[PDB]
Amino acid sequence: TTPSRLLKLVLPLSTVDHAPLALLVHPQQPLSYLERLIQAELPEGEGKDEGEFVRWSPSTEIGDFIRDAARAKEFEVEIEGSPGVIKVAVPSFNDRTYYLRQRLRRTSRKISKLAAIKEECDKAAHRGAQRIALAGCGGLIGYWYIVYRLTFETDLGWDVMEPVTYLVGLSTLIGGYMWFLWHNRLYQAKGFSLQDWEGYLEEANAMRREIKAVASEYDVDWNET
Amino acid sequence: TTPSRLLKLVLPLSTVDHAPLALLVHPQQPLSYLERLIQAELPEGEGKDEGEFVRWSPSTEIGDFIRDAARAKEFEVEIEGSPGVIKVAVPSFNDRTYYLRQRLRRTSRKISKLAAIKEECDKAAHRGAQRIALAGCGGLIGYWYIVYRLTFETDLGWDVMEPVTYLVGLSTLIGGYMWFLWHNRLYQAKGFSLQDWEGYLEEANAMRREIKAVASEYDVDWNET
Amino acid sequence: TTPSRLLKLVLPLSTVDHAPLALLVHPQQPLSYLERLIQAELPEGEGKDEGEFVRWSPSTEIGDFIRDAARAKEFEVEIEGSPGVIKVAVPSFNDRTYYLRQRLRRTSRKISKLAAIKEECDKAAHRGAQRIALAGCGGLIGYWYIVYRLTFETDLGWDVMEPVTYLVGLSTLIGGYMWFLWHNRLYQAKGFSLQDWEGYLEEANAMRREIKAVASEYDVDWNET
Amino acid sequence: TTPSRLLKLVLPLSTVDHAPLALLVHPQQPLSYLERLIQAELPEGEGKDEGEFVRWSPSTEIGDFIRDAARAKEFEVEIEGSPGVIKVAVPSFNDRTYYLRQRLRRTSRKISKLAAIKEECDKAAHRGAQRIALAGCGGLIGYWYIVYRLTFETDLGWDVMEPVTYLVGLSTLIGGYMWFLWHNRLYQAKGFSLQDWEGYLEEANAMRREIKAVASEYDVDWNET
Numbered sequence: 001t002t003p004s005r006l007l008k009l010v011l012p013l014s015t016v017d018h019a020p021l022a023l024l025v026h027p028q029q030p031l032s033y034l035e036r037l038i039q040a041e042l043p044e045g046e047g048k049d050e051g052e053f054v055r056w057s058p059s060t061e062i063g064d065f066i067r068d069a070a071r072a073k074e075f076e077v078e079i080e081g082s083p084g085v086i087k088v089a090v091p092s093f094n095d096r097t098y099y100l101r102q103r104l105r106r107t108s109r110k111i112s113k114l115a116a117i118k119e120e121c122d123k124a125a126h127r128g129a130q131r132i133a134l135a136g137c138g139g140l141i142g143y144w145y146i147v148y149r150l151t152f153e154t155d156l157g158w159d160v161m162e163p164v165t166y167l168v169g170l171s172t173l174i175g176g177y178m179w180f181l182w183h184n185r186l187y188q189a190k191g192f193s194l195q196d197w198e199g200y201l202e203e204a205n206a207m208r209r210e211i212k213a214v215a216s217e218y219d220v221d222w223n224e225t
Numbered sequence: 226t227t228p229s230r231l232l233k234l235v236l237p238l239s240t241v242d243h244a245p246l247a248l249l250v251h252p253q254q255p256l257s258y259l260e261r262l263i264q265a266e267l268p269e270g271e272g273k274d275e276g277e278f279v280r281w282s283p284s285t286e287i288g289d290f291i292r293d294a295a296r297a298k299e300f301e302v303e304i305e306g307s308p309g310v311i312k313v314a315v316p317s318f319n320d321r322t323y324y325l326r327q328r329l330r331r332t333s334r335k336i337s338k339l340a341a342i343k344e345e346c347d348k349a350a351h352r353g354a355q356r357i358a359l360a361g362c363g364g365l366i367g368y369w370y371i372v373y374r375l376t377f378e379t380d381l382g383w384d385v386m387e388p389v390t391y392l393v394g395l396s397t398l399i400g401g402y403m404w405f406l407w408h409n410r411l412y413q414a415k416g417f418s419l420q421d422w423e424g425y426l427e428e429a430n431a432m433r434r435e436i437k438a439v440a441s442e443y444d445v446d447w448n449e450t
Numbered sequence: 451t452t453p454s455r456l457l458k459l460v461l462p463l464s465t466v467d468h469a470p471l472a473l474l475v476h477p478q479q480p481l482s483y484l485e486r487l488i489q490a491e492l493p494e495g496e497g498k499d500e501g502e503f504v505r506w507s508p509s510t511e512i513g514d515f516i517r518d519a520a521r522a523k524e525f526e527v528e529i530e531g532s533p534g535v536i537k538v539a540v541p542s543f544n545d546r547t548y549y550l551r552q553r554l555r556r557t558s559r560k561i562s563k564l565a566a567i568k569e570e571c572d573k574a575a576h577r578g579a580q581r582i583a584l585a586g587c588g589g590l591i592g593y594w595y596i597v598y599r600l601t602f603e604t605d606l607g608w609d610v611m612e613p614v615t616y617l618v619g620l621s622t623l624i625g626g627y628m629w630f631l632w633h634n635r636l637y638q639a640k641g642f643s644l645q646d647w648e649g650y651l652e653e654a655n656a657m658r659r660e661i662k663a664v665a666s667e668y669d670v671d672w673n674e675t
Numbered sequence: 676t677t678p679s680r681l682l683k684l685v686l687p688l689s690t691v692d693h694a695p696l697a698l699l700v701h702p703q704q705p706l707s708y709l710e711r712l713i714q715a716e717l718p719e720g721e722g723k724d725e726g727e728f729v730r731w732s733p734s735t736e737i738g739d740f741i742r743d744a745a746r747a748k749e750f751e752v753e754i755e756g757s758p759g760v761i762k763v764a765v766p767s768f769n770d771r772t773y774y775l776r777q778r779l780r781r782t783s784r785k786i787s788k789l790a791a792i793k794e795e796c797d798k799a800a801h802r803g804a805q806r807i808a809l810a811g812c813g814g815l816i817g818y819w820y821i822v823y824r825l826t827f828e829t830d831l832g833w834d835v836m837e838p839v840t841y842l843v844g845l846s847t848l849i850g851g852y853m854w855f856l857w858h859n860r861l862y863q864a865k866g867f868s869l870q871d872w873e874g875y876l877e878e879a880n881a882m883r884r885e886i887k888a889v890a891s892e893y894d895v896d897w898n899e900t
């Protein structure tokens with residue numbers, strides 16, 4: 001095919017061969033802008049055909065029109081007082097998603113490592129908590145057995161044991177108070193920001209929303225893989 | 226003023242009466258296109274007027290021009306080639322938002338439904354929790370009963386009971402501690418996807434932003450109710 | 451003055467008298483667009499003067515230029531091969547802030563009432579909490595006096611009082627547990643949404659930011675009153 | 676390639692060598708203006724080229740054209756009126772952001788300073804709290820000492836001390852309760868306005884959004900470090 005349409009990072013690029021010519025356009029504009037440019041090129045009439053080649057309205061939106069050009073996979077131009085009836089290619093779905101899909105992929109790559117780092121750190125802290133917790137539980141159960149034996153295996157009795165209990169509880173309060181003070185007195189080595197991870201995820205969400213929107217616009221059931 | 230400017234879902238429409246004819250235009254589409262249409266329609270010059278009748282430029286955009294027209298709710302047209310002067314209607318804020326506000330309303334309805342379903346399942350779980358809680362409270366009341374009966378209905382006495390009290394209290398702390406350790410070591414009824422709830426919510430908020438932007442572009446303080 | 455510039459809700463409106471003519475422009479565009487329109491009007495040269503009437507560069511931005519037009523309070527146009535050297539008015543600071551400042555004012559009006567409603571409701575809840583709290587404090591102090599008298603004014607003794615204390619503490623636990631359950635079992639009359647208030651405040655913040663930005667751009671020390 | 680395209684803080688500049696002359700343009704300013712400049716500069720036709728050498732339209736915008744030019748980092752010019760062909764430089768991403776990225780850097784510096792000051796005052800308040808806390812802990816340790824001495828250094832006994840313990844515990848609950856009731860009933864050193872901190876933070880984030888938008892408009896994955 002002699003002419004073509006290349007996509008660009010925001011807005012389509014149309015290469016037409018009548019030393020060819022190139023145009024930029026924004027999607028939400030109409031075809032009349034394009035007619036005006038093509039007319040100011042040549043030294044008047046012009047028409048656009050899609051589907052089976054019926055003429056569409058010049059006051060129509062482009063982004064609502066390339067989709068039909070794609071379901072037929074072509075685009076047709078007609079000029080009054082001249083030869084030629086020009087076929088032109090069209091971007092597919094993948095073509096529209098390119099330069100966008102790739103950026104999502106890069107962001108996912110950058111997310112994976114940081115997720116592994118979070119995994120490591122969380123597991124470390126969890127093992128610490130679990131072990132010290134089980135130690136404290138063993139301590140309490142030891143106290144339980146001690147009190148039971150001292151109660152029901154001696155002549156000492158509760159009349160000697162009760163103050164021991166009061167004093168031990170107060171000692172526990174003191175120790176807890178000191179631990180709290182000391183604590184008032186994390187991701188360092190594989191260091192990162194939770195907000196960096198959050199912002200990358202925030203970007204990825206909206207990128208997926210845009211992609212699924214375009215997918216629904218063509219109805220071609222997009223797969224993330 | 227028989228003729229007028231009718232709206233459609235995106236692109237305005239002009240019903241011009243001289244039968245009266247309906248012409249489609251895009252908001253970014255300059256007035257000179259309108260001149261070329263009307264010229265080709267009829268068997269040449271032309272002019273527009275607004276406010277106190279001033280002629281505007283022909284290369285001015287419409288979607289901004291209609292706003293100055295809406296300041297007065299009337300718009301004047303003049304033709305070189307026939308006598309007289311023509312008057313034309315203008316839209317209002319409610320006009321432009323109509324066919325754009327109904328969608329917000331419907332989405333709000335969907336949200337209300339799904340929220341009701343969510344609330345129902347929440348009430349179910351809450352009732353289960355209340356059941357377990359009352360089951361627990363019964364045990365404490367029975368404990369109080371047992372303590373009073375054994376104390377002031379027997380000869381054993383507080384000297385025999387107090388250690389049991391300290392013992393059971395420590396046992397209870399241990400038990401809750403074990404619940405913690407074990408713990409740390411759906412809507413098949415009327416299902417709704419959180420993704421769907423979220424998507425509807427975000428879409429509605431985007432609609433709101435668009436509408437308030439248009440409102441500020443007219444300064445007509447839209448209420449949601 | 452025969453010509454003028456009216457402000458519009460986003461973008462300036464220029465009324466020039468050569469049956470005058472009207473133009474819309476966006477601020478960030480350059481003066482060359484304006485030259486092109488004025489040239490396509492007439493049947494070539496054109497120049498713009500500001501300050502003491504020195505010619506500025508046509509590739510300059512407008513929004514950076516009306517400010518100088520305002521510090522001199524005029525604007526000058528010159529056309530080649532024609533008579534006339536046109537003075538034109540300019541919008542002041544207040545002129546740029548109009549249609550924006552008023553909207554802030556309306557939002558403030560709507561905020562005031564809702565603030566009063568919050569005041570009323572908070573005071574009601576605070577009085578409730580304070581009174582019931584003082585009642586509970588009186589109860590505890592009564593218990594204190596009772597225990598002191600029963601200890602050191604009888605032959606009964608702690609050997610009779612201790613179980614009363616255990617039982618009373620357990621009764622308090624039961625009552626607290628029941629209160630918690632019943633609570634699990636607010637702004638109604640002057641009802642509003644905290645999020646509505648929040649959104650209005652959010653709007654007002656950004657509006658003030660825009661206004662102060664423009665103020666710094668002219669350096670005219672804006673007062674909110 | 677002696678000639679080139681130099682940047683300035685907003686508006687690009689073109690140094691064309693034939694001494695070589697420097698011409699100012701605005702990014703939205705169409706190429707036909709550039710044609711008129713170059714035509715009037717010299718003693719007529721003209722043409723542009725990019726990629727594999729294709730002639731673009733003359734009514735195309737620059738600020739999009741430079742992007743396709745930056746795909747290759749070279750841009751070609753042709754003149755009807757002299758022989759030969761001309762080549763011209765192109766900017767890069769770092770070029771366009773230079774004089775726009777330095778501001779972000781400076782704002783980050785200000786933020787770091789003010790954060791340091793904030794942190795210092797926070798440490799002061801924290802040290803005061805630590806002082807009061809250790810003062811409190813001393814009293815509990817003295818309480819434990821008193822209890823042990825009175826108990827196991829005298830003949831009074833737990834039968835005389837236990838009620839005092841319950842009494843003091845209830846008194847302490849009452850005291851904390853009163854602290855609550857009374858409670859419910861700055862940076863003169865190195866001052867910083869929270870408004871200033873907030874404004875710098877928001878401005879920096881806006882700069883970031885602008886830069887990432889341009890990055891996606893080139894697909895050149897800007898890092899902040």
Ligand SMILES: [Ca+2]
Binds near residue numbers: 159384834
């Ligand atoms: Ca005893």
Ligand SMILES: [Ca+2]
Binds near residue numbers: 162
């Ligand atoms: Ca006791």
Ligand SMILES: [Ca+2]
């Ligand atoms: Ca006790």
